[PDB]
Symmetry: D3
């Protein structure tokens, strides 16, 4: 009855889960909370129960990339998670506007993965839950942290090569804001499994103070959403 | 300088535009407003300037289907429209839950068209603007009209045949709420052209009182959004 | 028992039907006939019974674009139509040869739609009926009206954008003659439903005298074909 | 200056060319003519100059399958051929109607090959020249030979397997008449190279007297078309 | 009970079969052997029983191109063949390295055909049997003939055109060694039918002494593999 | 100059690299070697320099899934790696033959990922280097460990759902041996970057003694290959 990859039980899964790519970030996040309980660490999947503003929610690492994070998300979604927010990093696709250190709260994503397409036809949108999105924006607002909003390109290719052109410039022209590797996968799995999803991202390419802010927004949103299930 | 299909000028285009499929519905809507000015009627595209709650916005018919409505939307988006809301009909994809006469406010759509794909790669999401979506939901709330929220399948096939199976059942299993023929196209064009879009739909298959409510919600939302540009 | 979109009954459908995009053109055509009976006008679909050279046939508008015209064509094909000719406008893909005002009678089309593909695999040809094509050419000949013949690109994209290149130049190099938005859809639906189809088109871009000629050819062809079923 | 695969020169290519799959059939055809000149035989490509009803035209074998016949057709089309008719065998896709020994004159084809798609987008139709089609039908008529007309499925798969279902039944439901392996390729290459093409086929599965008739029709059509260039 | 295209019986099929494109090459090969028996010649498919170094194996021509060779390979694979080696010609995709007359022993291929895709999804690799590959390399070694190794692009397009760019340059950049028209098809059919396959190729574009060497390698490999079934 | 994800320098990269999914397995492997040096551990990427049978080679974890492992492989391939062997786990696709605990040495893979397709067209084969494959088989032989050989399905979907059928059964019918999530990606990246690749896998679904054997084979192969560059 322990989940195959997360190595936690269904009973340990909270209604709200904060997901990040780097197991290292789970450790940086848990110390910002009021208290925590280390649950498991298997492969790239580190799981910790966070206690913040009177609420209880997991923080779990999902690894780099769509196929690996899908394993995490399916295990969460099929064992009781109701809300999953991804707090990640990204590149900017609008370098004149969205700069290193800026924070973007994303409502939808480009499905440049494979796993979403093995679950549902490509015409289906990768879209986040509105309430989750609204909650994230309202936490940023009350903490007086400027944020951008927009679509993320979730691509399985970190390192392009020179035979098949990358579609990033196309998507920049299409007004996509940022790029990362997991959000589209989260969104599609969430929709299929009736789990509410969202995404908040910090730009590092194309400030640890801004990371701190981003983390506070994400933790604030998780606690607010957790109250609806407690 | 008159738009090719709408036969109105750039000067007649308001920041907010309400779009519907049936030119007949434009006439039913304009009489609900405080006053109106008939502007043009060419092919299936009927254009009227609506006056409601102190604000000015167009109501324009777009015809049945994605290729025909894209012509309308491009003409609007490239000549000054900032916000386009589609008020339409739809079928239910969740017949146990969403019944004839129910109203659905949609945040995203399945791109089962061609024109969106001739504009941008299929992986790109058809997603509405959050503020437009929020505004529509808040008008429904203050008018005490129950609504559903969810994804619409926008399909170019009204009448299926028995050789290639329809994907509607797949999309129902994927938790799509309703189906119609234009919303995905609107959403994608809007994103590409920096125009904020949304969709409110009334189920008729798989009550004129509910139509009345739906129209009041749509008109209420248009006026609220129009104040941001006046 | 009234057709859902055309709002005419099966009994009102004649063996031969002339289809056009613009409901306005139905009114310009009906007055050229010996007499007519207005039948219905719903959404963009205007239906009139035409009387010409001793024969009876409908003239029906189908609207702009493939998804909307498919609704019209399916309603006709599934309720007794045997022959459907499209009389439309188009752009030239061979600007040195085929000029504004020229008339093209088309035998086949490029399926740059979606609905045909939701009915049958893309490898299937959009091709007109030979007898219909022959009849159209022979009416042009006896009226001494020069015509071109060739393939039409039926595209769902009227207004290209600058991210995904348009395939029009490719199709021009491939020796496609003209471009419009509906003929491929008509052809494929006709083949699937055992209805004989054809297309005659007048170039306006890339003379009302030529429109007059084109209309006479189309009406002449309809009457000739109608005699085979009377 | 000898063609790479046919091993004949440009000077030996006539305006009209009759193509068949089996080099053996070229020998059976040449003896039906008034006289002939053996030109070349290289790989599967046998070339003979036929003399019939006062006209001169080549008969050339193209081998089994699309990639191999494309080599033949390109060599012909790029070195002066104006008209190419394929006289072949086929299976029936309408077994209640079209029986073993029946003859089908085809106007269009399903592009279930690869080479046509490496030349032009899949949406482009594989369609024959109308005049060639008309000529074939009129020769059958004057010889009092009943023929069918319809679309051929040109498939690269002779022997299906049980993992990926064959699309033949789908195409039968779509009203395709017959199936073979080369006609779509001929049609597309012809259109691209401004060469007029056609196809006449004899059903053998799913009578040498009927083969004789079919050959007379094809030879009759070739001579008639040859007069337009002599 | 005679195979439909090869016109030989199941009893005449040996465990090892050497395949070539040109029926002419079968005649050049059979005279290099210790003795031979001409079996059949139908269409482009010439079949001869070869006797070499104490072993018995067929040499069969498959024609130009994937659809035609698939017919040959299926007939062989479904009637007892255990090992099929293709001895062919090719172009060089690495012109600075791999020169006219050089020999390449190929382990895998690019599936630029259609028939393989009508048998199994495109993601499936066209890959040869390792033992066959090893055997070919070891015969070259003991005959002191330098060879290259690498991937072949098997393309259905011999003659490119100027609308759709050829992927050959892409595949050259991807480190494909050579190009021909049949090896991918052989490999995929072999895998599906549990037949061990391989390929040895001589470059002629982008020496009959080298052809002689290549033939000795292929015949040497066939005899070695034949001993495992005798 | 430290690699972005591995956090090791180019100077620390050895000609031969052993890759595994689980950073935990790197620790189990390093203690089997004669000695080791822990280099880095960042995200899911653990890097250790292994010393075995007189040779030096890295062991590096790549995480679960194609997009995440591509990051690892690109960093290795673009900074001096010449040989990469994947030692992994897998499921059996031939449950009557290949059982839990069995070892499979794979020559090729099914590309059911996205990243390989963002690098090169789908028709390109995912194929391993023959010498690497041969070396692995010869180490198994000298250690008297029975192994299977065959193709792996590399799929981005660990957890199927019930809307889009999984292709695993199709691939089982096609004679694929096993399934995992990374080998196709490794193979394609290796081919593109001129790095020799291979794969050895232990079945756990559909014995730690067998794991021990598998590890000895992999370490034995790495040392043998390392001698060619030392
Ligand atoms: N695709 C992409 N993603 C990112 C990210 C975001 N995440 C960082 C990590 C790879 O370093 C993945 O989990 C995604 C930062 N920069 C980039 C970039 O340049 N590209
Ligand atoms: N696809 C689809 N759309 C609709 C709609 C909504 N609109 C109604 C009109 C076609 O009748 C189009 O503009 C879309 C109602 N019912 C249905 C249905 O059954 N199917
Ligand atoms: N695709 C396309 N069609 C047309 C047409 C023909 N019809 C006119 C109408 C759009 O104005 C559609 O019903 C198709 C005229 N010009 C053009 C053009 O530039 N492009
Ligand atoms: N695809 C297909 N073609 C044919 C043909 C027609 N030609 C016969 C030859 C293969 O035997 C090819 O050149 C195509 C006859 N029967 C069949 C069949 O069952 N299938
Ligand atoms: N695709 C391709 N194949 C070849 C070949 C190899 N074979 C030669 C024959 C066509 O001449 C086919 O059976 C494949 C030689 N040159 C070339 C070339 O330029 N291109
Ligand atoms: N696709 C797939 N892979 C595996 C594997 C192999 N690896 C184990 C790990 C996921 O548990 C990935 O890195 C791939 C074991 N079992 C299975 C399975 O059932 N399916």
């Amino acid at each position: 009855n322990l989940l195959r990859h997360l190595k936690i039980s269904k009973e340990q899964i909270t209604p709200v889960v904060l997901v990040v790519g780097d197991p290292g970030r789970v450790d940086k996040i848990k110390v910002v909370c009021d208290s925590y309980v280390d649950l498991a660490y298997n492969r790239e999947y580190k799981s910790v129960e966070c206690h913040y503003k009177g609420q209880k929610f997991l923080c779990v690492s999902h690894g780099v990339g769509s196929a690996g994070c899908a394993v995490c998300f399916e295990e969460l979604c099929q064992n009781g998670a109701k809300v999953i927010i991804r707090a990640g990093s990204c590149g900017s696709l609008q370098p004149d506007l969205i700069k290193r250190g800026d924070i973007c709260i994303c409502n939808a994503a480009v499905r440049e993965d494979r796993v979403s397409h093995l679950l549902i036809h490509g015409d289906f949108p990768a879209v986040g839950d509105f309430d989750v999105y609204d909650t994230l924006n309202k936490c940023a607002q009350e903490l007086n942290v400027p944020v951008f909003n927009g679509i993320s390109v979730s691509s399985d290719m970190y390192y392009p090569n020179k035979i098949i052109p990358s579609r990033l410039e196309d998507y920049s022209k299409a007004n996509a804001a940022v790029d990362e590797m997991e959000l589209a996968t989260l969104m599609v799995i969430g929709t299929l499994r009736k789990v509410k999803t969202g995404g908040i991202l910090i730009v590092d390419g194309c400030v640890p103070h801004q990371l701190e802010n981003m983390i506070k927004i994400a933790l604030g949103a998780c606690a607010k959403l957790a109250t609806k299930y407690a």
